Amino acid sequence: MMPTPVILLKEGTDSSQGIPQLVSNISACQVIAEAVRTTLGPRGMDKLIVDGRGKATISNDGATILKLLDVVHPAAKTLVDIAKSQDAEVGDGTTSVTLLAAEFLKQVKPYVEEGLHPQIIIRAFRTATQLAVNKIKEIAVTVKKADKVEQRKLLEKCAMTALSSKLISQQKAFFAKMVVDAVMMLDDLLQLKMIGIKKVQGGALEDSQLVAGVAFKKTFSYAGFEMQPKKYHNPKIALLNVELELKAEKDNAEIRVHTVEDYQAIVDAEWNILYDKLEKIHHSGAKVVLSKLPIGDVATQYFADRDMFCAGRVPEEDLKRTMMACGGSIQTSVNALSADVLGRCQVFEETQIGGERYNFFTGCPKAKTCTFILRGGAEQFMEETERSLHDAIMIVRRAIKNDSVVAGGGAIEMELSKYLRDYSRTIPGKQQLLIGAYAKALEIIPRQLCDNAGFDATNILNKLRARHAQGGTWYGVDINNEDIADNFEAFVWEPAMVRINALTAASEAACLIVSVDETIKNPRSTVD
Amino acid sequence: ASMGTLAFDEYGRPFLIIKDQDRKSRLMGLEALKSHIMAAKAVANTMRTSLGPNGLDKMMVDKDGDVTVTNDGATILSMMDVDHQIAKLMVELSKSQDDEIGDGTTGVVVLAGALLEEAEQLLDRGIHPIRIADGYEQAARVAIEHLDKISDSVL
Amino acid sequence: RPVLVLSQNTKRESGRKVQSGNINAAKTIADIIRTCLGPKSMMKMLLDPMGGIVMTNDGNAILREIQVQHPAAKSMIEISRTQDEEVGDGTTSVIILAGEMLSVAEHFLEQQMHPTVVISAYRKALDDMISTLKKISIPVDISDSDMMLNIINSSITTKAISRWSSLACNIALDAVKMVQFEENGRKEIDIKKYARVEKIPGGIIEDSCVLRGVMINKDVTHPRMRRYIKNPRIVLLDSSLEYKKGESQTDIEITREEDFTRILQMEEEYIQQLCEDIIQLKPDVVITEKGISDLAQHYLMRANITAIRRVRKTDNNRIARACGARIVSRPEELREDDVGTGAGLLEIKKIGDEYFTFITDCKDPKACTILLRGASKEILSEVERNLQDAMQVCRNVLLDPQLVPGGGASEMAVAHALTEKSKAMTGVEQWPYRAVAQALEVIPRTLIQNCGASTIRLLTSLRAKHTQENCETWGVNGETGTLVDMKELGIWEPLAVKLQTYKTAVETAVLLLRIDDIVSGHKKKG
Amino acid sequence: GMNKMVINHLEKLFVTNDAATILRELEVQHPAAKMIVMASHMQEQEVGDGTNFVLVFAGALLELAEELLRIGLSVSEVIEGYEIACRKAHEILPNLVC
Amino acid sequence: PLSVFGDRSTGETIRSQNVMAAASIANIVKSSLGPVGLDKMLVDDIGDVTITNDGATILKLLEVEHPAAKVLCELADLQDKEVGDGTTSVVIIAAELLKNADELVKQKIHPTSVISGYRLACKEAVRYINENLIVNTDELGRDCLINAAKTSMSSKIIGINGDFFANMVVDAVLAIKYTDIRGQPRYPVNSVNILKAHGRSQMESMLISGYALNCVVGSQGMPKRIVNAKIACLDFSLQKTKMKLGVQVVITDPEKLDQIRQRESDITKERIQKILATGANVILTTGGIDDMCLKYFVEAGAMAVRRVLKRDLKRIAKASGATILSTLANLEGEETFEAAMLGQAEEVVQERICDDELILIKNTKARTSASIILRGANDFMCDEMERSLHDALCVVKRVLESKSVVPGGGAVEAALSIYLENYATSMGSREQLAIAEFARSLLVIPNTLAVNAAQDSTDLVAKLRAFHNEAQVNPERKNLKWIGLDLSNGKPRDNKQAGVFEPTIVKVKSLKFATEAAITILRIDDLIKLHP
Amino acid sequence: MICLAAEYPAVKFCKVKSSVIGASSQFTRNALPALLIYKGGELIGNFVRVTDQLGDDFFAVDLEAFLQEFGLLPEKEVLVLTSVRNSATCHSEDSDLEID
């Protein structure tokens, strides 16, 4: 190198190229993987991450952990990106994708160090991934009966398997039943915004309940609210998008009068406008009034005089869920409050839950929405419960779309590894080494399960390999019995798309990482 | 045992993965459990002297010099200025017990501290903490059933 | 705490970047003095960090005065120093050749050819170039003084002393001839020790001459001694002629009245005894590397003997060789053979405002001094460097009587021979062989460029001429930019100079082509 | 070709093997390199592909022009020869249609 | 809780850190292995430059902070000291062994099992090398020595000139042969004085049939050449006599002072006369000589060399038959110098080498010695030439001492890998995996050789392994054990017929040292670094 | 110093800016040119304002004589021009040994 008085790129540009930078990229991917390594399996462990502000986020979800980690390595961000992709498309397996991608990179690192051309490795990964996806689609178990009881049991088992890695795994049967019921009460699109998640401090996990209806917190009651009855036995709900309070008619409105009679007439006109709105609402026969916009104290007292219930400033999504559960329509005007646009629920009640007041709309027979009310001893407790339930809900939705399942516990991956090794043993040999490396890399998840559980991974892996070779498809890791077992017969079920997407994303990330050979970092501008 | 990891690569090239990785700390494995158990034990031992009719008050002073003589465990832990995350978990546990019930905000902390203290010696003998948690859950179910059994009704 | 495998200051650079940097540094070092080659070279001014000014077009001095950081440049400078020390000429030529070979090597290095193949091709080409250079050489009769003067002229037409060519050639030839020595069956020249160059600013350059003896910047100790002796008998010494302390601790203890006077009289008598021992040989001049006491001066003066003191050991050895004397460190062991007879005149004369001592009529002297008169100190320094080049060329010719055509003829002939030889390889290594063969054309190209004529037309014409049969002596007239036959122009250079230049350039390229990793910043750990 | 992760001055990841994108996302400072970059971008705008060809051909032409200037040719002679050869290549190209 | 003023690393963290340090050291020197390897060029941040290929030199110059990297550095130094060759190979092998053992540990294999497997693998590899891969040099002649020297000098700056350098090295080594008691011919390398001087090309390097001194005559009046030299080796300065500390001169009568002062030099005069009266022509002393004694030698027309190094003087005395004399004192209490104390040589000259002069003692009698004058282009090239020359001399010494050699070019490593992979199935259950990983790690040398040549490493090593497997399976295909790598063409080749050889001691010592270092590093699972 | 380093290889001439050391404002402004001398780990040279006794045109001869006046420069040693080098390393000699 020479000074070159006029340098080519901007001063401070950093460049790395060749085999060393690719090995460094592989090492960085390994470092990213080992951050979520111990979170996998029923013996997984949560991780605590504190941001700059001092707030702590306790989580077992791989995608959340990777997002909270401030990764700046250009090659390492690919693992976080594929974890986010797996979370978005599927919702489960956010740790398996990272483990698989990093294990692929580690397995092909020795061949990279020997000067092998990366295009060959990329081609080998593409071939192996295509074969593995086809094998998964072929051997996945599906039932051509569409039995409702069988479908419910399948969904419950899938939810239990999804939930048996988090802190709510003790009540996994309870939460799986709740999640399956909530998802089956969704109508046709399985919108996530139609499932409410309410987190209330205090109480045990078993105290958490699912409301076949809608529920939301009490919202800034005005004076006179305590005089309204708090229970109805067949109320008609008037969902409104209306500001029910004395106020100026319009922002640009201006009143010009030159007589005290007109002054009194104007005052009475304002009062009569408000009273006309209130009387139009009351005459509709409704007993519960909900408004997205605030409801004033005058309206609150007016409704209290009529033994009616009112609640303004209701959150918009809560109003939408109430509309879906009760079957009314949100009205921006009160001029036509017909029976068509009035909601109906069997029972409305305001009860106290852990030092807070919640409004309950139960007894809805045609509800297409739900509301989870979660209890726990700490804010992170409710947050992690919500994350686990979100994973379960995504799994159940995907299973609703297609009830094709594969056994868990690493059985599917051991079968895939055996199949890929058998295939690789019948090709010239430059691709054979790489496909065999891919098949061996597929063994990472059962080994990680055994390592987290405190087993001896080598003996269990040998037993699994022998069992798969000699005949047997769904033999995985039995955590409780310190041994291996038929995981299909043990109801450790998993939707096929989870493993399909995991393999696809891991292969794409590995190919992208291997392809790059030069890293250039232009200097930061305006560090400040 | 701290400061995360530092490699600088085997080729001598810079190895930066996490932003400000030099100024971040990391506890891994059993050491983290031991530290958390010790902090929770300290909090529980501080609370345990304010239990019962012969309990003694805690004189709590905020950042403005306001003085609050109190025995309520939830109030003491809410006004306490802590930095350890496990201490914040203890404070939130007291707050949750107060919100759900309103009484017993001190017994929960002492019970949790005792549970973690026993878990310490259980871990020292080579038991996976998930096994300890499962055993604690089973024992808690048994104790709750027994409490339901020996409960008595009042008018 | 930043724990690292290597120290923080250690920096490692590797890859093709290292090879490119080394080759670029060598190219730039060559470009430093590319313009200082040929009879039309332009001189350069160097500002010495100690405050002096060096004005020269010699390659070695220019490259020595430059401080560089890139270690490839240090390697090139060491190459220049080695070439200067080994033969005394061809410094710019070897630097330019090394740069050109490294350029044509970088050519192949940009492709997928391993450097070891280039090294092997370069070594094969070096063997072939040595063979061809020996083949196209011609013998020289060293007895013919005209041919020797012509060779020295060809060696000094490229320097500032070229305007006084006959004078410089005669000075160098006479100095080299009379410093030549042979004893115990061993022949030696020893330009470094004897054949001193003494420069005195002032006067005119045409007054410069080589003396048949030695001149020193010394004066008589006492004014009463003779400053002009016809046929001196010179005696040389190392030991001081004064009373000196003994080696061991020798404290005296005086308890009598007359012991102090006796001690002082004994000192005087010892000095007188030494002077009498010297006088017994009846010399005329006594030269001492150390001090001569005033009483010793008196006792020598009473015998009509000129005494000079405090002379450097090198000057005393030169005087011994010139006048045929032997230095004696103990006067009591002085022998007749040690007395130096053979000097034909000794004369102390004043030049400017400072006395000088001449012993300048020796018959058959084996040492000499070269007296340089010039405009100033820098001009005389450049003249001395040119004289050094001339003497080195003369000694190279005397040691090896082989000559090779100059002015680009040798390079073009060797390039054509290697190009023809490369036609029968049919290997992957023939391309570097041919490239390093035609890389020798940089010398005729540089001569043409410095002359000012068109490079491409003249070089193509020269190559076409050399493609013929008996045209190995066709070179470039560096003054007019025309092709001439150097058996007519008369430019010739010693075969040793060309061989050393080619070998050094090729091995510089070989050494710098073996490097692909640079680490720096570590402590010396000494 | 091998993809390159280029991180611009705003820490936006740019992994690609498209020459125009790489050169756009590089902080090129040397004015001659700037002219080459502008030529490549003009090729991208006019046609849509061939930017890497443009840059490689320009680099090779400049290397060989440096060699020619070293061996003795003047700048004007090299420029005239390059223009003549470009015209000849443009004439030849239609006959190469497959 | 510990309250230790320092930093602690435990578990997989410290293991991975140690492996990373070892891998960094290995990767530093991995590019300087094999004939297609290329030199490095260090700068000592004061301007000093060192161009070299020797792994030991590179690792010695570098400043290293990590303890495991240090361990590999002194491993390189020890391999250089005990053998003199295979330094880079042993460093690379140790680092690869550590890396693979750490992978096995990460697979939840206990480190003690890995250590036991490594010990068994090293023992079995040494046994297999000694029983199947050795080639005796008795039936080869001088060709085996020449080929071993050429193989040693490949990858060095003198590789292409091997045809000449190997002959020079073999002649120099055979010149210094001596058979000691019990009749074991020992070859004392480091008795060959290597002299460097820039100037003429490499091929002008001279092998002196005698001894070369880096010193000149003390006075310009002495002759510069003596035909029939009678060397007198002395170990004391020849100056004016000075009394010891316990002796003090006190004068009470002035008449004695002149006699005292005269004797102060007449003592040395008498010593010089006694030495010269025996016919001595060359006088070499470790101490200094003042001007008076220098003139005394000048008048006699004899050599006189001062400040001669002690080792050079000892070598000259042993070669020429002279006896070192630290003092002139017989067993009768007198001061005498017997004529039998004089060495002899056929000529002593002061030749000129690149504007400088040195003394050559040509063809000493009663013993034959040697010295090499290396001519290069500059100081750096001469230093690298000297290092490569020392490597070749050590290789020739090892070959001539123990008459067993093994084929080079990675043939031994491939054969060992195949044999150990086939053999690991017959020992234990987890040390089986350890031995398999040892066998796999042994393949790093051919892989690095192939990579340095920019060839297809995977295919070439696969072909080598197939050849060696066929050799080890078919009893009648046992001539394939010598199939090594030909880096010039990138194809497997019979290295025994080609002429690529190495001393067996190189491979054996490298394996043993690498295994010991891997075991030593693998023991660590916890590091405490106290604050300074 | 450059000229003197060749004369005395034993001495360890070195230079350093006052900014990095942490010199005081007055020392930086009007006490910069100073010849700090250390031997045995303790100060031996107490020289500041070297221009006061040397001026600005002092040569290496002037500085050498001035330092030798106070007896601080190590005495010179006789030196000769080696070819380049002789030694390579020092270890077990294993010199020639003629044995029966």
Ligand SMILES: Nc1ncnc2c1ncn2[C@@H]1O[C@H](COP(=O)(O)OP(=O)(O)O)[C@@H](O)[C@H]1O
């Ligand atoms: N009861 C069980 N027995 C064995 N393995 C299980 C069981 N439940 C889940 N697993 C395994 O846990 C893995 C997923 O762990 P988890 O942390 O829930 O999701 P992620 O894939 O995001 O890590 C699956 O590969 C599955 O095989």
Ligand SMILES: Nc1ncnc2c1ncn2[C@@H]1O[C@H](COP(=O)(O)OP(=O)(O)O)[C@@H](O)[C@H]1O
């Ligand atoms: N009158 C001349 N015409 C043409 N070439 C010449 C003439 N005189 C010398 N040369 C050539 O110039 C070269 C000498 O260049 P010079 O400046 O002495 O370089 P260096 O100092 O490195 O020897 C020789 O090769 C010689 O052949």
Ligand SMILES: Nc1ncnc2c1ncn2[C@@H]1O[C@H](COP(=O)(O)OP(=O)(O)O)[C@@H](O)[C@H]1O
């Ligand atoms: N002619 C050749 N052909 C193939 N391989 C060779 C040849 N010569 C040497 N080698 C191999 O190259 C390697 C070079 O080793 P080297 O780096 O010189 O050892 P050290 O570690 O002492 O420097 C040796 O292991 C040898 O097996």
Ligand SMILES: [Mg+2]
């Ligand atoms: Mg999961």
Ligand SMILES: [Mg+2]
């Ligand atoms: Mg209480």
Ligand SMILES: [Mg+2]
């Ligand atoms: Mg010249």
Ligand SMILES: [Mg+2]
């Ligand atoms: Mg394109």
Ligand SMILES: [Mg+2]
């Ligand atoms: Mg070697």
